């Protein structure tokens, strides 16, 4: 599918908050504290509920949202957690992860507290609701769970990224575990098929806190519209002979190289820590071991396929 | 994105101050435009989008904050005639083309 | 000396905020978030300045102030710090630890960042200002410091308690480091003799956050008026024969015993409280930096095991094709 | 208005206050021990001493709307209580002082 | 006050030991290893008790003692500790920090292990003993402690310096924490007023090591006799006209300048000195606990790479056999 | 080969030092400090030389020595290092790693300081000498090195173990890296063939320190005599019917189990740290990953062999 | 390793004190011998060697330390007639056999 | 015996002492500046002040056998030097005091 960036349903730093103290094109309410770097949807205080919801409604047949967030806790047990909603109307208040109940849409819940006593939490649960089913907070919505994966997203050394994609009546939740600073290191967590959501709806995020307290920070929320490769009209003869791009690109690369060169000697023209650097090196080593093992798995799968092709003869 | 909004020297000149300090009031129209494209891409992706342009035209330099409808209208008018690949992003190919 | 508790210059939990979300007898400004349990004067966000000051001026010759606070940060180095002021005017906004510069009073600064580069932070710095000296932020105020002591008050399992006592023109700052849950385990930090402060002044406490981020929570702020043992008038013949005091004391003790006995069988008759011990809420920063690393191993192990079975199957089925063909 | 007898002797408020922890409502209590329950339930710090902050919390309260008292007014009631009950000038109120008035 | 250096109760480098391997004017006993740079009073071995005491008794009304020492251990928790004594008799062997119990004097104990289980260690404890009180080792001496302060003196990039000053019946202990290489950056730790000590006593310093192991090195021990500014007799007319002092001072300064200038071109004329900066000698314990972990990864990487090439060859040659047969 | 334990040429804790202050059957001199747990051959002081040498001479055709030692340094650069000697006479003093020069035998040098300036150190170097060649300290004996391996043995979390085996005119040095507490996790470091050493010689250890200072502790030194499987006479009919061993073994196992049971309830009859336990868990995880990778390598080598057997047909 | 050196009760009785305290003065000759074999194997390998036996017969319980030649002679006489597999170690099979 | 003139004016000892760091032997120096070299080379702490410990190190010395002085004897010479040269009763010896005798 082809991706189109949508600014109207997106917030991002480092200029997240405008001069008047609000995030553009989004409505926040409750205990959410918007800052330049991030939005603290629920601070580490007792009984905090917050939510940031979009102002205008979105008409997207297929969409994709990339959410970067951190959940930071002092202890090993946290409450309550974060939630990402595609609804029909902004709740902006309520007991379901800081947002209203009886929502008409889809809600991805990053539950951190195990109210069912089954050791499944922390979990990422996909729950859809037409508007007549109450969310079961006392058992983490296990009976109403369309899909669930058991991944940890608390106190990670790097911010946790999540890609939620709705493309041709199926919803896929992919999770970056947060052990690497790469922004394209997603891993499969859950998926559901034949998912029905309204074409008109509001994108939003929310967080709730119970007795135990976490900081629920959201750094970015990028909403992308996905269009099918065949349904999109090409509208040709609009690139303007295609030659000016090739005349401009190398000049701009040369100028950015010379700007980097200027910054190189102006950094020292007029003027990391030990242990932290060692921790970064340790995490890079773990990531390199992971990449090597994955590459070995891919090579062995190629080995698999080739042996089977020989087997067929 | 009018021509005079980007072809003014004092704004960019006080903007690049702090890291690079080369006062030179003989910049070509494609030079200060390039600087404008360089500094406003905060993510470092060499690409401009709706949020970056919205923070560019509002900025922090008194005057009342602009209306949300007016900002949406002007940024939609900018993205309608400047974006050619319909990617939601603005590149210097499209930026210098229009 | 003799201590009298002063409610009009104090706040404490677990009902710190009223129904309208304001602290009684106190005015808060900046990025302070007053909750029921505590007041988060500066949350762990970039460029946050907050302060909570008294509404009414306090005219005390001698006084004692007990502050319970937590400074919690993710990293080992924190920013910016906390400050407790006895000033002349209010200090709601400013650049000096979230409070205004050029104050006429005394400010005890809990500094967590070493701007001077002398490796003497975190520290408790006593600075007196008549109203004409600017606070030197870039040198941690070491040039105009009346006294200092080098203690750490960040990332402790128990809240850090501090006593600031002005008595006979001597300001004594004593610090409980918060390693133990004892509320009376104070240790001497600093003192300033012949300290001059205004007779009437506003109490307050402020917090600022710089490039690094810490949460600066305040759980209690207890103010006591101190009177000399000789200057206090006794005013006798007011105890009303002292006999009903002894007739009520044992009744009160028996009521406590009866209530405790009743709670003893009603805490376990219907056990539904989850509970939260202090062991499950505290973890050292470096230990955390180890635990994640351990978690970073638990992923890799999985990618071995799957890979293992893959090699195993390229064993098994191959043998079959080996067995069948030969 | 202040620390009146009927405000402390209200059995319904005491019974609805001890719910959750004390699960035994009995409508025969004498006007003596409900004062003990009031004193114990309004001392949050566990030090068996009522100060101005705890008394202000009791007087202002939240019971489920009702308008809140002014800060000057609440200061007036708290200062009137302290000036007429705190015999030892300690700031805190013992049980003997509470039973005196 | 006025300070006079006393050589007979002092030792320092870089020639601390004589040709026969003994410290001048000092007697060492136990497991002490006197070297040229320092004295290792207790090495990092299990059950080591050592002490170095003065040979001649010192009769000072007021005195000041500066001790430079390092306590270096592998783990975060150390054992047992150090002690500086001004006693009546020598304390060569015993159970109290490597020194004998029931001493008639004053002992400043640097305790690194918390036997009482109160999380108040490491600490500097001032204990005075007339000769009838046993040291309570299992409770860290908190019952009979005259004063205490909570400082950390282990695993520092620079040696820890301590000043013990007895002046007008007041014993003041000030501590330089050793984060900076400044030799005059002391901070107040504790004081005891109306302290009673014998008029003549032996100086000494001892160290003990328990279950955990630390090295207790002492680089210097400087003793000063303190005289009151009014009680010291000036004895004038002894400067011999003071003119040759000024005639020699500029000559000495010129000699220093000439020697420095000569060393400036002879340090680089034949550069052969390897050098050893302080950055290459200091590393935090936890950082070490990280670095080894990083090294633990560098092994595993190798076992991947070899394994990688093995799979690669079971690619390559197989293709040949695939290519040849089909 | 068959192994025989030799107590006369061995020292070991936890009773290493006798009542009179000396190690049995061994002679120590210099700055070596013998303790109950270990022998500190060279403490962390400037210009320290120590050595512990055996009293009686050993007549072993083939032998094997297992040495457990730690080298602990405050900084990242250390000097001078440890040495294990099989000589003809005890030097007990000298400038070659705390022992004499012109030794008649074989010396394994654990050099930690790079005097040659080639970044090869720390290294384990095997140097033999008839008694006429001086050890080249200024370049770590690179010209006279019979074999060398580049392994790090400083500041390891666990004591470093080393097996030196001389069996049928070849000397093999195997090194445990010290990342695991296992005593049988040796790895190949170096070997030499046609090595000639005198049949009469003294076993010894030594350590030296320069400007930079390390603690050189030796925890154990187990000397084993290796005999060929064919040259050893069986001398049968000496097991005494072999039945009493089977009658005694299960009874002794039952009694040691019941003694463990008694100790179990007497441990709690009358009565590790966080972070240290986490470090132990991290090192155990690294060891388990290493073991899994080695097992995968062995399985792939089996795969190799089997494919080649099929290839032969 | 004489019979009376191992068949005495007070030494082992004061030896097991601290961890296991069961005073029982009716021990069989194979019981206190077993305890003697158990405690003197410090390495936990369920096996006795020359060093462990040498520390056993010297011990820390005054009397002058024994001669090195005498200790070598007595331990060699012990190992000569007790060890059967010529392993350099002493097991309870060999220990109870002789 | 003590801090005699010939002990400080010995050019050979000064020249063999400055070797390694000062690589310039010249046998024409006046009896003035070799005292400066002695004072600078025997002040190890760099504080330009000679105390009893540094003087004892200089007097006892190691030059490559020779028997060492007794502790009472060394105390006698050091105390005789301090009693006759330390004019300000500081314990330390300045260069002016050294040049006085
Ligand atoms: Ca939940
Ligand atoms: Ca659950
Ligand atoms: Ca951009
Ligand atoms: Ca575009
Ligand atoms: Ca600061
Ligand atoms: Ca500072
Ligand atoms: Ca109370
Ligand atoms: Ca009262
Ligand atoms: Ca202790
Ligand atoms: Ca203690
Ligand atoms: Ca070397
Ligand atoms: Ca080398
Ligand atoms: Ca054994
Ligand atoms: Ca055997
Ligand atoms: Ca000096
Ligand atoms: Ca002088
Ligand atoms: Zn109520
Ligand atoms: Zn000399």
Author numbering:
A (entry chain F), F (entry chain B): 42 to 312, 324 to 365
B (entry chain H), G (entry chain D): 41 to 101, 108 to 144
C (entry chain E), E (entry chain A): 42 to 367
D (entry chain G), H (entry chain C): 39 to 102, 108 to 144
What does the paper say about this structure?
MCFD2 is a small protein composed of an EF-hand domain with two Ca2+ binding sites, and functions as a binding partner of ERGIC-53 in a Ca2+-dependent manner.
The superimposition on the central S-H2 coiled-coil demonstrates that during the conversion from form A to form B, the upper and lower CRDs rotate by 4.8˚ as a rigid body. As a result, the vertically assembled pair of CRDs can rotate to a certain extent (by 4.8˚) as a rigid body.
